[PDB]
UniProtKB/Swiss-Prot annotation, chain B:
The chain holds residues 348 to 396 of 1273 of the full protein. This is Spike protein S1. It comes from Severe acute respiratory syndrome coronavirus 2. Binds to host ACE2. RBD also interacts with the N-linked glycan on 'Asn-90' of ACE2. Cleavage of S generates a polybasic C-terminal sequence on S1 that binds to host Neuropilin-1 (NRP1) and Neuropilin-2 (NRP2) receptors. Interacts with host integrin alpha-5/beta-1 (ITGA5:ITGB1) and with ACE2 in complex with integrin alpha-5/beta-1 (ITGA5:ITGB1). May interact via cytoplasmic c-terminus with M protein. May interact (via N-terminus) with host bilirubin and biliverdin, thereby preventing antibody binding to the SARS-CoV-2 spike NTD via an allosteric mechanism. Attaches the virion to the cell membrane by interacting with host receptor, initiating the infection. The major receptor is host ACE2. When S2/S2' has been cleaved, binding to the receptor triggers direct fusion at the cell membrane. When S2/S2' has not been cleaved, binding to the receptor results in internalization of the virus by endocytosis using host TFRC and GRM2 and leading to fusion of the virion membrane with the host endosomal membrane. Alternatively, may use NRP1/NRP2 and integrin as entry receptors.
Length: 48, 49
């Protein structure tokens, strides 16, 4: 597991099919991959 | 547009550097249940509507 945080518009884009800024420039997940994705609220705890 | 008499902007004979459109602003849906919306460069489209 790796620490990660990204936009709430792109929090639903965690699937390895959304190829773009999130994938080609930030992090790409291989097609033959096994793993889980979990998340919780972090907007009020850290915001400016 | 207002959605009651929707038009069809037919893209004529030209070149649609799709990466230029992807360089403008982030996209929200980007969901394409067809051709892969990643390698939209090296295949040729007859007409776009």
């Amino acid at each position: 597991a790796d620490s990660f945080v990204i936009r709430g518009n792109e929090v639903s884009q965690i699937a390895p099919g959304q190829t773009g800024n999130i994938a080609d420039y930030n992090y790409k997940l291989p097609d033959d991959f096994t793993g889980c994705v979990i998340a919780w609220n972090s907007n009020k705890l850290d915001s400016k | 547009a207002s959605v009651y008499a929707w038009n069809r902007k037919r893209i004529s004979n030209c070149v649609a550097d799709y990466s230029v459109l992807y360089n403008f602003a982030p996209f929200f849906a980007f969901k394409c249940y067809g051709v892969s919306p990643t390698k939209l460069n090296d295949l040729c489209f007859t007409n776009v509507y």
